[PDB]
Design a protein around this ligand. Structure first.
Ligand code: MG
Ligand code: MG
Ligand code: MG
Ligand code: MG
Ligand code: MG
Ligand code: MG
Ligand code: MG
Ligand code: MG
Ligand code: MG
Ligand code: MG
Ligand code: MG
Ligand code: MG
Ligand code: MG
Ligand code: MG
Ligand code: MG
Ligand code: MG
Ligand code: MG
Ligand code: MG
Ligand code: MG
Ligand code: MG
Ligand code: MG
Ligand code: MG
Ligand code: MG
Ligand code: ZN
Lengths: 60, 173, 225
RNA sequence: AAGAAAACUGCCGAUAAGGUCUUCAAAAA
RNA sequence: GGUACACGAAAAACCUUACCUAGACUUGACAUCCUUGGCAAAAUUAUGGAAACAUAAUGGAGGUUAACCGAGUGACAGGUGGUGCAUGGUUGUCGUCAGCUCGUGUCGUGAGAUGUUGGGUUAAGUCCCGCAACGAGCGCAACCCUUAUCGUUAGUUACAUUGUCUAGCGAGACUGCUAAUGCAAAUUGGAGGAAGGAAGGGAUGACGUCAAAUCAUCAUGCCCCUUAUGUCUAGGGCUGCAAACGUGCUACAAUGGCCAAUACAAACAGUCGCCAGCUUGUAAAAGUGAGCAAAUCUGUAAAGUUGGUCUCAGUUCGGAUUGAGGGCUGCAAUUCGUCCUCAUGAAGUCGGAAUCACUAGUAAUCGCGAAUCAGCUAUGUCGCGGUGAAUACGUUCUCG
C-alpha cells in the first residue's frame, strides 16, 4: 500500500492538518526535504548526477 | 551497403582457427589460501604437436581459462622437442621413467593403430607416430605421464647413429 | 569497502551540473526538479537504439531548453523529421503547453569514451544471452583501440543465471580514482535479465584535465580526429 | 679490565547437526 | 557483540499508519491497450449520516476534444504479502589500516616461490640501497575545500575612532639555506619567517571478510492473494507495565541558590515568515502595528563583572509527583500536545563489583542557530561562538 497513499496525499483532504508532504519521485513519507520536495535518499541520486544546480560536495 | 544477409540468425558458431595441431589434456583447478577466502586459478596441460616430428608440452596457470590456455599454448611453442619416426612407429622397446611413473613403449606392426590411452595417446597422435604399443605401469597423473612418455621417446637410438659410432655399415648386420 | 560515487565526488570542481536553473520558491524548486528527472528518464529508457550519452536541461522563469547529444540521431529525427515532432509532443505534455520548448539534438564526437552508451551496450549484450566474458572482452578491445585510458567494468549480479551471485571486474591501465584532476566518466545501468537484475558499472579515464573549471566546454562531446 | 646477564613459575574449562560457491573453452566476423 | 538499543523515525492526537474493531467498494481510489462519445470533474450549499457514501442543487476551467470527462471492454491494475540464503543498488566492519595483485622472466615433477622478503627512513608497500628479478595497476602521498600572514580589485546594505570587514585573483613554506652524519633517501639542530619539516581540520576509505544490514526508499527473479493479503472512512493502537538493560537530561549545592544593575560573540534563518515598538495581562500570550525578500528589518546571548541576601540544613538545595486556574496550535488535546501562574515538595548529601570519552582552543562547561514541523518534556540530531584546562616517565602488563 504505497501508490494509493501517494495518490491520497496528492488529493486535497477535508482538513488542512490532514495534509502531509511525501517525496515526489518515490513515495517515502518520512525524511522528506521541504526545501526540495525530495526525500533524503533521492537527494543522493540527484546530487550525484548533477540534476540539481549548485549541489556540490562540501568540505568546510 | 547492400550487405545481402537473408535467412540464418546471427554468428552461429563457426570457429576453425588452428595451426601445428594441439589438444587440451587436462584442466585442473588449483587454489591457495589467503587472509580470508581462497585464490582459485585454473591450470591447463596443453600438448602441441605438428604431427610430423615436432611436439612439445606446456602447463600454465591463470585466473581464467582463456588466459591460462594461451599461456600454455605459447609455453609448448617454446619448449618443443624433435622426434624421429621409423615406418610410423617407435624403433625399439623402451620404458620411460619419471618419478614414480613408468611408461612402456613397444614397436608395433603397421596397422594396429595407437593402442595408447590418456596422456600417451595424445602424445603419440601429436608426435606423428601411428602404430604404437603402450601400457601405463605407474601413476595416473597427466603431467607425469607426459614427462615419462617424452623421456622414453627422447632416449631412443636411431638405427643409423648406432652403427655409425659402432663403426659398422649403415644398418647392415 | 564502499566508495563515493565517482561522478558525484567530482561535482563543483571539474564537472558542471547537468541541469542549471534557479527557481522562484521552494514549491517551484520541487516541480522543476522532478519534471527534469522524468524527461531525462524518458529519453534514456525508451529511444535507446540512438546511444544518447547525456541530456542537459536549461530553464529560466518560463523557457525550457534541452540539449541532447546522441550517436545516431536518425531515430530521433525519424523519416523526414517525423519522430522528432513526435518526441516534442511528449516533452510539451510533461512540462506544460504554457511554455516554449527548444529541442537541440546535437551530434556527438568521440562516442566511445562516454560511460553511458558503453554501459548501455554492455547491458544490451547480457539480455541477448551473449556470453559475458566474450561480450565484455569485445567491448573493451574496441574501446581501448579507440584511444582512451584505462576502463574498469564491474558486472555484479546473478551472473549467467547462477543461484549464487558473483562479481567480475576488468581493469586495463592507470585509473586513478582518488585523484580529482582526472577526467573520469561514470555511468550505471540495469541489465534486466530473465533470471533477475544485472548491475554493470563502467569507469572510463579520458586523460588529465588540469582545468579548474566545471565543464564549461564539451568533454567527450568534442569532435577530434 | 675483560666482562656478561639472567628466567621462574596464581589460576586459565568448554563451544549442538548437515551444509553452498565455480559455471566451460568450444573461440571466436 | 564489537559493527543493534535518542537506530530506520530530520517530528505517531487526526493525518502519518504499514496494526485492531467496525461501516462501505469491486477492470476498482491510480494506469495503459483496445470500439466508442464527449454538451466535465471540482468545490460548495441541503437531507440522511461516526464519517465513508448516497440521494437534490450553481452545472460550470476549458476546448469541441487537447489534457481529461466519460461509456463498452477483457487483457489486467494492486500487495509496506514471503524469500537481503536468488539478487541489483546503497552501507557497517577490519580501516584511512597499509596493504591486495598482475605481465614477462627464473626456480620447483607440484601446490607454489621470486618480485612484495634484507639494511636504513617514514603515517604509509613513502623513499633509498641490496637483491633472479625487471616493470606495472589499485591503494599511500599531492592536486580539492577551509583556518593561520600579506599584496591586489571593490567600497554599499559594510566601515565611517578609516582601514576593519566582506569575496574575486595572487604572493607566501619549497627541508628553500646552513650545521651535524649517511653512498642515498633521509633524521636532528639553527637562521629568517604569520606559518618548518604531513602548519590544524575536512572530503577522499584498495582486493576482500562477516551468505554483515535492507524485498518497509526504489528497482527486481520467483512464490502467494485477486468481490481480497486490494480500496475509502470513523474509532482505537504504535504512548501499556510486576520488571531488566543502553544512551542522555536534572541533581544531591555556598566553584552555589535567589534578587538588581551590566559588558563582550559567531553562524544561520525569515513574507501562511522574522516580528521591532506601543497597550493589556502576576505570565504563558492577546490587540495595534511599522520594518525586512534582507551586510539594511527581526530572531533579548549566557557563563562573565559589581552589589544585596541566604550560613551547611534534606535547606532560600533538589525538582519529582499531585490539584486548580489560564495561554497557543489545531475540525478535534480523555486515551495522547506543550507553555505560564498558583498549590505540594518523592528520591537524592557523590553512588558497589565494573566501566566510557579525551593529547589545545582539545576535555570540561555557557549560551545561539538550523533541519523535518500547524503544535510537540528533541533533554535528540546537525552546526556556531564565549570561558577554558590537566597529563604523557615508559611499553613490564592490557586490548586490537
Ligand atoms: Mg510500491
Ligand atoms: Mg503534519
Ligand atoms: Mg585478522
Ligand atoms: Mg588465589
Ligand atoms: Mg562437557
Ligand atoms: Mg549490523
Ligand atoms: Mg493513525
Ligand atoms: Mg461544457
Ligand atoms: Mg467530439
Ligand atoms: Mg547479505
Ligand atoms: Mg606483503
Ligand atoms: Mg630473495
Ligand atoms: Mg626489493
Ligand atoms: Mg588521499
Ligand atoms: Mg543473513
Ligand atoms: Mg514486493
Ligand atoms: Mg483513522
Ligand atoms: Mg515507537
Ligand atoms: Mg544600520
Ligand atoms: Mg524586547
Ligand atoms: Mg531550588
Ligand atoms: Mg491533555
Ligand atoms: Mg591522537
Ligand atoms: Zn524519495
Amino acid at each position: 500500500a504505497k501508490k494509493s497513499l501517494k495518490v491520497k496525499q496528492t488529493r486535497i483532504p477535508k482538513f488542512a492538518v490532514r495534509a502531509y508532504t511525501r517525496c515526489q519521485r518515490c513515495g517515502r513519507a518520512r525524511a522528506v526535504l521541504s526545501h526540495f520536495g525530495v526525500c533524503r535518499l533521492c537527494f543522493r541520486e540527484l546530487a550525484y548526477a548533477g540534476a540539481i544546480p549548485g549541489v556540490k560536495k562540501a568540505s568546510w | 551497403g547492400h550487405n545481402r544477409n537473408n535467412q540464418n540468425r546471427r554468428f552461429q558458431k563457426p570457429a576453425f582457427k588452428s595451426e601445428f595441431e594441439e589438444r587440451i589434456v587436462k584442466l585442473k583447478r588449483i587454489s591457495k589460501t589467503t587472509k580470508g577466502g581462497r585464490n582459485m586459478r585454473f591450470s591447463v596441460l596443453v600438448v602441441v604437436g605438428n604431427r610430423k616430428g615436432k611436439i612439445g608440452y606446456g602447463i600454465a596457470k591463470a585466473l581464467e581459462v582463456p588466459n591460462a590456455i594461451k599461456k600454455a599454448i605459447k609455453a609448448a611453442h617454446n619448449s618443443l622437442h624433435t622426434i624421429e619416426i621409423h615406418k610410423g612407429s617407435i624403433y625399439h622397446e623402451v620404458i620411460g621413467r619419471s618419478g614414480a611413473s613408468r611408461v612402456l613403449l613397444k614397436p608395433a606392426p603397421q596397422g594396429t593403430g595407437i593402442i595408447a590411452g590418456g596422456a600417451i595417446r595424445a602424445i603419440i597422435e601429436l608426435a606423428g607416430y601411428s602404430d604404437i604399443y603402450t601400457k601405463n605401469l605407474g601413476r595416473n597423473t597427466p603431467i607425469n605421464m607426459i614427462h615419462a612418455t617424452m623421456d622414453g621417446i627422447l632416449k631412443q637410438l636411431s638405427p643409423r647413429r648406432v652403427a655409425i659410432l659402432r663403426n659398422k655399415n649403415l644398418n647392415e648386420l | 569497502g564502499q566508495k563515493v560515487n565517482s561522478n558525484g565526488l567530482r561535482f563543483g570542481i571539474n564537472k558542471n551540473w547537468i541541469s542549471r536553473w534557479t527557481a522562484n520558491s521552494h514549491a517551484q524548486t520541487a516541480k522543476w526538479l522532478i519534471e527534469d528527472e522524468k524527461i531525462r528518464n524518458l529519453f534514456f529508457v525508451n529511444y535507446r537504439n540512438a546511444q544518447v550519452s547525456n541530456v542537459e536541461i536549461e530553464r529560466t522563469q518560463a523557457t525550457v531548453d534541452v540539449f541532447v547529444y546522441a550517436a545516431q540521431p536518425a531515430f530521433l529525427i525519424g523519416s523526414e523529421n517525423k519522430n522528432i515532432q513526435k518526441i516534442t509532443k511528449q516533452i510539451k505534455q510533461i512540462i506544460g503547453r504554457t511554455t516554449n520548448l527548444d529541442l537541440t539534438i546535437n551530434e556527438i564526437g568521440s562516442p566511445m569514451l562516454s560511460a553511458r552508451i558503453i554501459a548501455r551496450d554492455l547491458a544490451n549484450a547480457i539480455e541477448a544471452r551473449v556470453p559475458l566474458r566474450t561480450a565484455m572482452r569485445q567491448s573493451l578491445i574496441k574501446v581501448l583501440k579507440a584511444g582512451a585510458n584505462g576502463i574498469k567494468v564491474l558486472v555484479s549480479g546473478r551472473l549467467n543465471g547462477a543461484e549464487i551471485a558473483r562479481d567480475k571486474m576488468y581493469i586495463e591501465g592507470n585509473m586513478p580514482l582518488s585523484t580529482l584532476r582526472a577526467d573520469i566518466d561514470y555511468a550505471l545501468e540495469k541489465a534486466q535479465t530473465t533470471y533477475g537484475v544485472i548491475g554493470v558499472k563502467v569507469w572510463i579515464n579520458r586523460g588529465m584535465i588540469y582545468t579548474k573549471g566545471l565543464n564549461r566546454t564539451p568533454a567527450h562531446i568534442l569532435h577530434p580526429q
